[PDB]
Amino acid sequence: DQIAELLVESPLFSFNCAHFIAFKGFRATLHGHNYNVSLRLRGNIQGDGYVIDFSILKEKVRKVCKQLDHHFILPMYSDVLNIQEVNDNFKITCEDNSEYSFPKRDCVQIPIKHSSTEEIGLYILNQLIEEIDLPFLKTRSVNYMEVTVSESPSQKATVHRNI
Amino acid sequence: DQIAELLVESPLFSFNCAHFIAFKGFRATLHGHNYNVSLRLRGNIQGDGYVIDFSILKEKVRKVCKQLDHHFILPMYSDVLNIQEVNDNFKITCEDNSEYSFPKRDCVQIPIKHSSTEEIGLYILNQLIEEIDLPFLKTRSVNYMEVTVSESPSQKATVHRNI
Amino acid sequence: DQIAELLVESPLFSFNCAHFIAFKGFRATLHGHNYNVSLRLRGNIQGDGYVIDFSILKEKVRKVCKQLDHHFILPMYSDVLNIQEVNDNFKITCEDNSEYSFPKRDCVQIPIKHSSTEEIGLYILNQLIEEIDLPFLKTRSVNYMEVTVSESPSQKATVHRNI
Amino acid sequence: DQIAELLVESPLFSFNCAHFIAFKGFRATLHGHNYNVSLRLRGNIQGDGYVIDFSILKEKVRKVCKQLDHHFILPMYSDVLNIQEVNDNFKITCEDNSEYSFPKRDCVQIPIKHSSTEEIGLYILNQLIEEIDLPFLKTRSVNYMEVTVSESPSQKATVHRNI
Amino acid sequence: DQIAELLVESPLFSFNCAHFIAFKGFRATLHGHNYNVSLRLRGNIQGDGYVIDFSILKEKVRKVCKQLDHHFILPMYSDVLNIQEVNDNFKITCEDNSEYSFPKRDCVQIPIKHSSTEEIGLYILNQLIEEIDLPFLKTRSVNYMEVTVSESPSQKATVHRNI
Amino acid sequence: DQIAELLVESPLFSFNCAHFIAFKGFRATLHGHNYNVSLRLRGNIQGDGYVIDFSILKEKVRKVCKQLDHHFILPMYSDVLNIQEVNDNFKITCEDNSEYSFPKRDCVQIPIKHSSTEEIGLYILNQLIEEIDLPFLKTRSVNYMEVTVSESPSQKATVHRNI
Ligand SMILES: Nc1nc2nccnc2c(=O)[nH]1
Ligand SMILES: Nc1nc2nccnc2c(=O)[nH]1
Ligand SMILES: Nc1nc2nccnc2c(=O)[nH]1
Ligand SMILES: Nc1nc2nccnc2c(=O)[nH]1
Ligand SMILES: Nc1nc2nccnc2c(=O)[nH]1
Ligand SMILES: Nc1nc2nccnc2c(=O)[nH]1
Ligand SMILES: [Zn+2]
Ligand SMILES: [Zn+2]
Ligand SMILES: [Zn+2]
Ligand SMILES: [Zn+2]
Ligand SMILES: [Zn+2]
Ligand SMILES: [Zn+2]
């Protein structure tokens, strides 16, 4: 068996989102990014000549990205945000008493503590493994999945899981 | 006299901002972009061997970009937004009755009608001409200034002025 | 009224095709390219804040590209190819008596003389104007349409029409 | 001894080829790509200050690429193609009875089963090791050779050998 | 007749040179750049399907670049450098009495006043027109030649001539 | 604890320098490059949501690059250069008796043997670890630091240290 490593990356694996960083003793102003996601994996070349079909990887990266795209990214588990439900909005109050309010539908609530590149990457890695399907990955012999998320062209975080 | 056209462009001429599009009968969800700005100009090669020093162009593009960077871009002259001052926030109400509220300090109020790439480009062109200084441009023989703004790598608007 | 120039470009505006160059006294071997298409246009900024919506330009460039993608590009009007219909294939005979045969369904017959970048560009420009629709372009005030086609990252042809 | 990893990559390490994918129960239409090859290696920094001279790596990557460039890539060992020699052409018949015919000189016969990126990568890795020369690599202390092949900017396969 | 505009550009159209800027009241320290050159032209599509063959443009841009590559660029006509021939070296004395000495063979003497991007561009434009040959350009119907030179990815000068 | 790998890279992490290669039996002519530096590291995601703040990495890469930028890179420990102090210049004599002279202030003396990409990379890795501060790195849980230096877009050397 011959090992190969596949990489899929594209301006199309994008989610254009608003966010702000907040942690103890610090709060950034509201802003946004064209986040970009690449996926790298490793398996054996199968009898059909692929480790896994690029088209499927492109399809599922696109799908995960599309869920986040055009939303404010709202961390569910932050210890420094007070997140209130007010009518059809989320009202967010910070430790410096700064206050924000967005329509709930404008927000994507993600099970992370900080809208950092690192934590977004871990979330996307887990979602990608679910969307492509872990049993399907194993039928193709894939044993390594790795996600890189960039906030901008100049700063990236990369996380992996051995499967 | 020999004409030359200068172009300055960089991942550094960036402003990472939140915005949303709204015009009659339409409203986008809140999101954001890594906007990128390039500047192109035309003049004669001067006795010092430059049309104008690249370093100055880089300095002033950086300065304009830095004013917008890390803010929500708020159009001053929109006919479809109701912009209210509430304590230290701007409260924005849309035609579909969607409601947003941001700290005023998180916002940059710009004299445009829509936070589109085109209108942002016209604004930045005017600001760049002021920052570099129109008389200084004319001492260097510059007769054309042109700004390109990209919302993402795949979509750009370009505006110019003959000076 | 303020003029703006819009550019849309992307790794997504691609057609991955086979072709070969043939003209009098010359014939290239069969090969292929990831062709890439960009579109540039000029009009006035409309009351909605756009010259024309980027999404529409992306949609129609994608559509034209998709018709050509994954096919052998077969020039209809070449003076140096003998193109024969044999069962469900096109058989192509060159001036040096070289012979090719492809399933007709693997081929896209294009009303050009040479599968050059220049002639492909003129064809795509005409198709893009039809797909976006010339009357619709004029309602948005667009007066200039320009297509760039690249055979590879290092060689491009650009054609335009004043409308 | 200090380890260093060298990477050579360029738009010049290209082969612009036609191909089609075929495996059991599937056949793509004829098309093509600007394939691109990068080479990465690891060794110790030698007394001359190089692990190995970049110029040699560039020379040999260029040479391998040039053998494939401007040809139809024909897999020698496919279990789903019937490859016939007819006069000075190869006639290829697929499982769905689709038929192709190319001049033999337009084709490069490669000892692979599928013209996939993965299998092309393994072939190029083996050829690069022969062209640079395995004993010469070992005199420079190189212990790792790795090839990345891209079908297009957005999809790549990477293979390696420990030497 | 249909007009087309051709562009050739590549990491290969490079000259990696040392230089320093000097003009009245100013002198930069010795340093260097990977200069990059692109060529754009305009003519009619000819009966062979090309305005002019890309391969020729690539060949001649390469040739001009190769003459400059791996040398110190020495302006022949500077009003602020004292250039002395000392044995087999050029000794250069600046207005601040700074002194440099290089082997003559390490230098390329260019008929410019300043080693600026603008003046280098004008020189390369003139050399490219000579290398491709002005009569040959006119037989292909080319009526516009334009050169862009970049000192680094972020700063470029563009010059043209109507022929 | 979750591991993440951070990458910072930018056209801004540049030093535009002159140099020449010399080793036993060989000497290159004087020339230069836009060198580019990227930094990759690995640690655990901290309670603030970062492995380490990108801004600090960008700040210190910039600082190291700025020390080298706009200078001739002069290796301190070369066995094939005779480096003489003459008034306020360094005079360099090669094994073929070629002679150079530069103002000392135009030169950066680096504790390397060859101005190769590999040795420059090892030097920059060591300097980056000092500038960011090794104890500070360990408080953020960083256990791996890796530097890539490119002489041009097409040739790179990568070195690392486990900390
Ligand atoms: N490490 C790290 N640093 C950052 N700095 C600023 C903004 N975001 C980030 C981020 O997401 N991760
Ligand atoms: N023309 C144009 N179209 C757009 N489409 C979507 C988002 N922004 C825009 C934009 O800013 N300009
Ligand atoms: N001008 C031009 N030259 C070319 N050279 C080789 C292949 N294609 C082309 C092409 O399409 N156009
Ligand atoms: N994994 C993989 N997938 C593909 N999908 C489509 C075309 N080629 C390929 C290919 O070469 N490899
Ligand atoms: N306009 C211009 N400005 C510059 N600034 C610094 C170095 N070179 C240059 C240069 O070549 N041209
Ligand atoms: N490996 C290596 N090869 C080179 N070849 C030419 C110039 N520099 C280099 C260099 O710095 N490293
Ligand atoms: Zn951010
Ligand atoms: Zn937007
Ligand atoms: Zn071709
Ligand atoms: Zn293919
Ligand atoms: Zn310089
Ligand atoms: Zn060098």
Cβ pair F49:A158 closer than 8 A: no
Query: Which residue's structure tokens are 């073929």?
Result: F96
| A134 vs D: CB within 8 A | no
Query: Which residue's structure tokens are 């670890």?
Result: F129
3-state secondary structure of B88: coil
Which residue stretches of chain E are H helix? 54-68, 117-132, 134-139
Q: Distance between CA atoms of A109 and A107, rounded to whole angstroms? A: 6
3-state secondary structure of D123: helix
For residue E81, the 8-state DSSP code is: E
Buried b (16+ CB within 10 A) or exposed e, D105-117: ebbbebebbbbbb
> Is the Cβ atom of D119 under 6 angstroms away from ligand 4?
no
Closest CA to C154 of D148, D10, D67, B148: D10
Q: Distance between CA atoms of F34 and B121, rounded to whole angstroms? A: 30
CB atoms within 10 A of CB F28: 13
Q: Distance between CA atoms of A83 and A88, rounded to whole angstroms? A: 13
- The C-alpha angle with vertex D126 and arms to D120 and D130, in degrees rounded to 5, equals 140
Amino acid at C87: N
Amino acid at C73: I
> Is the Cβ atom of A117 under 6 angstroms away from ligand 1?
yes
Closest CA to A28 of B153, F141, B152, F48: F48
Burial of D147 (0-12, 13-18, 19+ CB in 10 A): buried
Cβ pair A118:F45 closer than 8 A: yes
Residues of A with CB below 8 A from F46's CB? none
- Measure CB to CB from residue C32 to each of D11, D18, D103 and give the nearest one: D18
Closest CA to E118 of E31, E21, E8: E21
> Is the Cβ atom of D117 under 6 angstroms away from ligand 4?
yes
Paired residues of C86 in beta bridges: C89
Angle between helices B54-68 and B117-132 (to 10 degrees): 130
Q: Distance between CA atoms of E29 and E41, rounded to whole angstroms? A: 36
Resolution of the experimental structure, in angstroms: 1.9
Buried b (16+ CB within 10 A) or exposed e, C22-60: bbeeebebbbbbbbbbbbbbbbebbebbbbbbbebbbeb
Q: Distance between CA atoms of C77 and C54, rounded to whole angstroms? A: 34
CB atoms within 10 A of CB B122: 21
- CB of D62 closer than 8 Å to CB of D56: no
Q: Which atom of ligand 6 is nearest to the CA of D53?
A: 3
Q: Distance between CA atoms of D7 and D5, rounded to whole angstroms? A: 7
Cβ pair D31:C17 closer than 8 A: yes
Residues of F with CB below 8 A from D7's CB? 148, 155-158
CA B70 to chain centre: 13
CA C31 to chain centre: 17
Rounded to the nearest 10°, the torsion over CA B112, B116, B118, B119 is 0
Q: Distance between CA atoms of E163 and E143, rounded to whole angstroms? A: 5
| C10 vs A: CB within 8 A | yes
Residue boundaries of the structural domains of chain D: 1-163
Our mutation pick for probing the ligand 6 site, out of D6, D42, D50, D56, counting the most ligand atoms within 8 A of Cβ, is: D50
Question: F156 CA to chain D: closest CA distance, Å?
Answer: 5
Amino acid at C40: R
Query: Which residue's structure tokens are 């960077």?
Result: B69
CA of E67 to the centre of ligand 9 (A): 29
- CB of C157 closer than 8 Å to CB of E6: yes
Tokens of F134: 């090794």
Name, in order, each residue with C-beta under 8 angstroms of A53's C-beta and a sequence gap of 6 or more. Answer: none
Paired residues of F39 in beta bridges: F8, F147
Q: Give the side-chain half-sphere CA count within 13 A for F29.
A: 20
CATH architecture of the domain with range A1-163? 2-Layer Sandwich (3.30)
Strands A72-75 and A107-110, sheet pairing: parallel
CA of D50 to the centre of ligand 6 (A): 6
Strands E26-27 and E22-23, sheet pairing: antiparallel
CA of A52 to the centre of ligand 4 (A): 8
Q: Distance between CA atoms of E149 and E38, rounded to whole angstroms? A: 7
In 3-state terms chain E splits into helix, strand, coil percentages (rounded to 5) of: 25, 45, 30
3-state secondary structure of D129: helix
Q: Which atom of ligand 3 is nearest to the CA of C116?
A: 11
Buried b (16+ CB within 10 A) or exposed e, B55-90: ebbbebbbebbeebbbbbbbbeebebbeeeeeeebb
Tokens of C117: 């970048």
CB atoms within 10 A of CB E104: 14
> Is the Cβ atom of E21 under 6 angstroms away from ligand 5?
yes
Q: Distance between CA atoms of A133 and A39, rounded to whole angstroms? A: 15
- Measure CB to CB from residue B4 to each of E113, E155, E158 and give the nearest one: E158
- CB of F109 closer than 8 Å to CB of F76: yes
| CA torsion through residues D27, D28, D31, D33, sign | negative
Cβ pair A23:F54 closer than 8 A: no
Paired residues of E44 in beta bridges: E3
Closest CA to A134 of A147, A123, A150, A145: A145
Closest chain A residue to the Cα of B33, Cα to Cα: A33
Name, in order, each residue with C-beta under 8 angstroms of C117's C-beta and a sequence gap of 6 or more. Answer: C35, C149, C150, C151, C155, C156, C157
- State phi, psi for D126 to the nearest 5 degrees: -60, -45
Closest chain A residue to the Cα of D125, Cα to Cα: A4
- CB of C126 closer than 8 Å to CB of C117: no
Three-state secondary structure of chain A? CCEEEEEECCCCCEEEEEECCEECCEECCCEEEEEEEEEEEEEECCCCCCCCCHHHHHHHHHHHHHHHCCCEEEECCCCCEEEEEECCEEEEEECCCCEEEEEHHHEEEECCCCCCHHHHHHHHHHHHHHHHCHHHHHHCCCCEEEEEEEEECCEEEEEEEEC
Query: Which residue's structure tokens are 């990559």?
Result: D9
Cβ pair A49:D116 closer than 8 A: yes
Residues of A with CB below 8 A from F2's CB? 118, 122, 159
Phi-psi region of F135 (alpha: psi -120 to 50; beta: other; left: phi over 0): alpha
Our mutation pick for probing the ligand 6 site, out of D3, D45, D53, counting the most ligand atoms within 8 A of Cβ, is: D53
CB atoms within 10 A of CB D24: 9
Q: Distance between CA atoms of E13 and D12, rounded to whole angstroms? A: 11
Q: Which chains touch B (3 or more CB pairs under 8 A)?
A: A, C, E, F
Strands F89-94 and D3-8, sheet pairing: unpaired
Tokens of A156: 């990236």
Which residue stretches of chain F are H helix? 54-68, 117-132, 134-139
- CB of D48 closer than 8 Å to CB of F114: yes
| D7 vs E: CB within 8 A | no
Q: Distance between CA atoms of C102 and A3, rounded to whole angstroms? A: 34
Amino acid at A76: M
Our mutation pick for probing the ligand 5 site, out of E21, E30, E31, counting the most ligand atoms within 8 A of Cβ, is: E21
Strand order in the sheet with E81-86: E81-86, E89-94, E99-103, F99-103, F89-94, F81-86
Closest chain A residue to the Cα of D149, Cα to Cα: A6
CB atoms within 10 A of CB F26: 13
| D54 vs F: CB within 8 A | yes
Amino acid at F157: A
Select from C9, C20, C34 the residue whose CB has the most chain D CBs within 10 Å, as the one to mutate to test that interface: C34
CA of C132 to the centre of ligand 9 (A): 28
Question: B4 CA to chain E: closest CA distance, Å?
Answer: 5
Name, in order, each residue with C-beta under 8 angstroms of A136's C-beta and a sequence gap of 6 or more. Answer: none
Residues of E with CB below 8 A from C33's CB? none
Q: Distance between CA atoms of A90 and A99, rounded to whole angstroms? A: 11
Cβ pair B2:E122 closer than 8 A: yes
Name, in order, each residue with C-beta under 8 angstroms of C136's C-beta and a sequence gap of 6 or more. Answer: none
Cβ pair A122:F2 closer than 8 A: yes
Tokens of E94: 């600046």
Closest CA to B150 of B123, B116, B125, B127: B116
Residues in chain D: 163
Q: Give the side-chain half-sphere CA count within 13 A for A80.
A: 19
Residues of A with CB below 8 A from C11's CB? 10-12
Q: Distance between CA atoms of B11 and A94, rounded to whole angstroms? A: 31
